[PDB]
Design an enzyme around this catalytic site. Structure first.
Site, short mmCIF file in Angstrom:
data_model
loop_
_atom_site.label_atom_id
_atom_site.label_comp_id
_atom_site.label_asym_id
_atom_site.label_seq_id
_atom_site.Cartn_x
_atom_site.Cartn_y
_atom_site.Cartn_z
N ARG A 179 0.86 -1.19 0.00
CA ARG A 179 0.00 0.00 0.00
C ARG A 179 0.90 1.23 0.00
NH1 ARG A 179 -1.40 -3.44 3.59
NH2 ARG A 179 -0.31 -2.33 5.27
N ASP A 244 2.79 -8.18 6.98
CA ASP A 244 1.64 -7.48 6.42
C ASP A 244 0.53 -8.36 5.87
OD1 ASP A 244 0.93 -5.20 3.74
OD2 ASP A 244 0.47 -4.96 5.88
N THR A 245 0.18 -9.42 6.60
CA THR A 245 -0.90 -10.31 6.19
C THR A 245 -1.82 -10.46 7.39
OG1 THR A 245 0.43 -12.26 6.82
CG2 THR A 245 0.50 -11.59 4.51
N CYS A 350 -0.67 -20.31 -0.25
CA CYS A 350 0.05 -19.76 0.90
C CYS A 350 0.72 -20.82 1.77
CB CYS A 350 -0.90 -18.94 1.77
SG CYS A 350 -0.01 -18.18 3.17
N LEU A 351 2.02 -20.64 2.02
CA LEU A 351 2.77 -21.56 2.86
C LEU A 351 2.63 -21.21 4.34
CD1 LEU A 351 6.12 -21.85 0.86
CD2 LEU A 351 4.36 -23.61 1.10
N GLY A 352 2.27 -19.97 4.63
CA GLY A 352 2.13 -19.55 6.02
C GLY A 352 0.72 -19.61 6.55
C1 HEM Z 1 -4.02 -13.90 6.71
C2 HEM Z 1 -2.82 -14.42 6.36
C3 HEM Z 1 -2.30 -14.67 5.07
C4 HEM Z 1 -2.90 -14.53 3.84
C5 HEM Z 1 -4.34 -14.11 3.53
C6 HEM Z 1 -1.91 -14.92 2.86
C7 HEM Z 1 -2.19 -15.01 1.49
C8 HEM Z 1 -1.31 -15.51 0.53
C9 HEM Z 1 -1.59 -15.59 -0.89
C10 HEM Z 1 -2.89 -15.15 -1.55
C11 HEM Z 1 -0.48 -16.14 -1.49
C12 HEM Z 1 -0.26 -16.51 -2.96
C13 HEM Z 1 -0.03 -15.28 -3.84
C14 HEM Z 1 0.22 -15.65 -5.30
O1 HEM Z 1 -0.30 -16.69 -5.75
O2 HEM Z 1 0.91 -14.88 -6.00
C15 HEM Z 1 0.49 -16.36 -0.43
C16 HEM Z 1 1.74 -16.93 -0.64
C17 HEM Z 1 2.69 -17.15 0.37
N1 HEM Z 1 2.51 -16.82 1.71
FE1 HEM Z 1 0.89 -16.12 2.60
N2 HEM Z 1 -0.71 -15.33 3.47
C18 HEM Z 1 -0.94 -15.14 4.83
C19 HEM Z 1 0.05 -15.32 5.83
C20 HEM Z 1 1.37 -15.72 5.59
C21 HEM Z 1 2.40 -15.82 6.61
C22 HEM Z 1 2.22 -15.57 8.12
C23 HEM Z 1 3.55 -16.20 5.99
C24 HEM Z 1 4.75 -16.49 6.64
C25 HEM Z 1 5.92 -15.85 6.40
C26 HEM Z 1 3.21 -16.36 4.57
C27 HEM Z 1 4.08 -16.86 3.60
C28 HEM Z 1 3.75 -17.09 2.27
C29 HEM Z 1 4.68 -17.61 1.31
C30 HEM Z 1 6.12 -18.05 1.61
C31 HEM Z 1 4.03 -17.63 0.12
C32 HEM Z 1 4.59 -17.92 -1.27
C33 HEM Z 1 4.30 -19.33 -1.76
C34 HEM Z 1 4.64 -19.52 -3.21
O3 HEM Z 1 4.87 -18.50 -3.91
O4 HEM Z 1 4.67 -20.68 -3.68
N3 HEM Z 1 1.88 -16.05 4.33
N4 HEM Z 1 -0.02 -15.98 0.82
C1 LIG Z 2 0.52 -11.46 -2.38
C2 LIG Z 2 1.30 -11.84 -1.02
C3 LIG Z 2 0.17 -11.92 0.08
C4 LIG Z 2 2.13 -13.10 -1.05
C5 LIG Z 2 2.85 -13.17 0.41
C6 LIG Z 2 3.19 -11.63 0.65
C7 LIG Z 2 2.56 -11.04 -0.71
C8 LIG Z 2 2.32 -9.52 -0.59
C9 LIG Z 2 3.53 -11.47 -1.85
O1 LIG Z 2 4.35 -10.74 -2.41
C10 LIG Z 2 3.28 -12.95 -2.16
#
Ligand code: HEM
Ligand SMILES: CC1(C)[C@@H]2CC[C@@]1(C)C(=O)C2
Ligand SMILES: [K+]
Ligand SMILES: [K+]
Length: 407
Positions: A179, A244-245, A350-352
């Site tokens: 943002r 920021d999630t 999402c991995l997290g």
């Molecule tokens: C409310 C919590 C969360 C939401 C809604 C969220 C949502 C997402 C989404 C939509 C993506 C895929 C984006 C794409 O396809 O380009 C993503 C990817 C990912 N998220 Fe989250 N996330 C959350 C929390 C977290 C947390 C706490 C971590 C930990 C560090 C995390 C780590 C990742 C990683 C490593 C990926 C990349 C996976 C890949 O590219 O194969 N996320 N997340």
């Molecule tokens: C779209 C996302 C939620 C996902 C994890 C952080 C984020 C901003 C990325 O750049 C990949």
């Protein structure tokens, strides 16, 4: 308008809907409500907005899911709008498409996956409780600053083995990527995040610890040593995911609970419904919206997409789609089939998300048992902000300490 890019020759005139993902016109009604305008009666399944440089927007879960599954046509190489940001974006594994993506995704999964979450359970529990108990007797708080940010961020910093005093700088940087306020371009914010990581990665490759950064930096990708540059691009992503999630999602959820005593009561009377409530809130207050870039000319749902065209595939919209969930804007903790793509869809799921669910469920349980009754500070005009990740600007809450419980 000077903010509208000239319509490209191949984009049908009737499909133009000038939606601004960084400042949606109906934002005052709530950010999810603002994006839901894309699902009103006479809006097509696929539209073109002339804002932010011009790009397509899939408005229904069916197309969003299909696009995320077809990585050969819809590449993650340039996943952000505007194009400049998408082009500078090189985080691993998110900027890669399968098959290349996999070896790196496996490593990332090892550092933030379920096994890691299980081990963090106690510390997540302890922090949630210490923060809430300290707020309890004060009868008020600035939720974004007093809990939404410190709770998930400190847990991530613990996992990453990084000094909490570094949060202000890192959080400012991450926010500029999701943002932007204009002070930094995506490229500048990314460069600063990488600059922060470079010496830390070098230090931990020499003397490795058990923290996530050490694990990534000294890890292997399908049998071969990860490079310093690769570790940096991966760790940068982890930082953004951790800062920021969940931080923003918790605020959307608590804003809703503060405004709905009936729902709070339901979870107070039936604590076992919290995990299900967590999923319904994840659907209703979904907050992410990134996308893909066309690898070649391709006809999709009767629309001619051209190579290089960017398409926003709002993860937020699938679950708000009436074609996926009846009365989508209604929060029903008993909703039978909670359909959504809040954590993405396809190879980049999402991995997290497991860490996220634990943090959310723990928050709901520990907060409601100590501060069961609370509300938005009288007169407060809650403001939402829109971007790659949407959030809540501020959330002042109040409550009578007399009604709280020191568990
Ligand atoms: C409310 C919590 C969360 C939401 C809604 C969220 C949502 C997402 C989404 C939509 C993506 C895929 C984006 C794409 O396809 O380009 C993503 C990817 C990912 N998220 Fe989250 N996330 C959350 C929390 C977290 C947390 C706490 C971590 C930990 C560090 C995390 C780590 C990742 C990683 C490593 C990926 C990349 C996976 C890949 O590219 O194969 N996320 N997340
Ligand atoms: C779209 C996302 C939620 C996902 C994890 C952080 C984020 C901003 C990325 O750049 C990949
Ligand atoms: K045209
Ligand atoms: K790129």
């Amino acid at each position: 308008n000077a903010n509208l890019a000239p319509l490209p020759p191949h984009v049908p005139e009737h499909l133009v809907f000038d939606f601004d993902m960084y400042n949606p016109s109906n934002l005052s009604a709530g950010v999810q409500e603002a994006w839901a305008v894309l699902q009103e009666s006479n809006v097509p399944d696929l539209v073109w907005t002339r804002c932010n440089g011009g790009h397509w927007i899939a408005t229904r879960g069916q197309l969003i899911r299909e696009a995320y599954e077809d990585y050969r046509h819809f590449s993650s190489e340039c996943p952000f709008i505007p194009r400049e940001a998408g082009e500078a974006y090189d985080f691993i594994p998110t900027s890669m498409d399968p098959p290349e993506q996999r070896q790196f995704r496996a490593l990332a999964n090892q550092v933030v996956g379920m096994p890691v979450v299980d081990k963090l359970e106690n510390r997540i529990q302890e922090l949630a409780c210490s923060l809430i108990e300290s707020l309890r007797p004060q009868g008020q708080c600035n939720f974004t600053e007093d809990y939404a940010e410190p709770f998930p961020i400190r847990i991530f910093m613990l996992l990453a083995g990084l000094p909490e005093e570094d949060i202000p700088h890192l959080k400012y940087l991450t926010d500029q990527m999701t943002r932007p306020d204009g002070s930094m371009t995506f490229a500048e914010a990314k460069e600063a995040l990488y600059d922060y990581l470079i010496p830390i990665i070098e230090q931990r490759r020499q003397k490795p610890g058990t923290d996530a950064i050490s694990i990534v930096a000294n890890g292997q990708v399908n049998g071969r040593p990860i490079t310093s540059d690769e570790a940096k691009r991966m760790c940068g992503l982890l930082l953004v995911g951790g800062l920021d999630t969940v931080v923003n999602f918790l605020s959307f959820s608590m804003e809703f609970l503060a405004k709905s005593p009936e729902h709070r009561q339901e979870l107070i009377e039936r604590p076992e419904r919290i995990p299900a409530a967590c999923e319904e809130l994840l659907r209703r207050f979904s907050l992410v919206a990134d996308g893909r870039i066309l690898t070649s000319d391709y006809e999709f749902h009767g629309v001619q997409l051209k190579k290089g065209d960017q398409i926003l595939l709002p993860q937020m919209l699938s679950g708000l789609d009436e074609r996926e969930n009846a009365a989508p804007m209604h929060v029903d903790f008993s909703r039978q089939k909670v359909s959504h793509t809040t954590f993405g869809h396809g190879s980049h799921l999402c991995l997290g998300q497991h860490l996220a669910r634990r943090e959310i469920i723990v928050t709901l349980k520990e907060w409601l048992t100590r501060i069961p009754d609370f509300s938005i500070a009288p007169g407060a005009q809650i403001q939402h902000k829109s971007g790659i990740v949407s959030g809540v600007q501020a959330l002042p809450l109040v409550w009578d300490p007399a009604t709280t419980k020191a568990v």
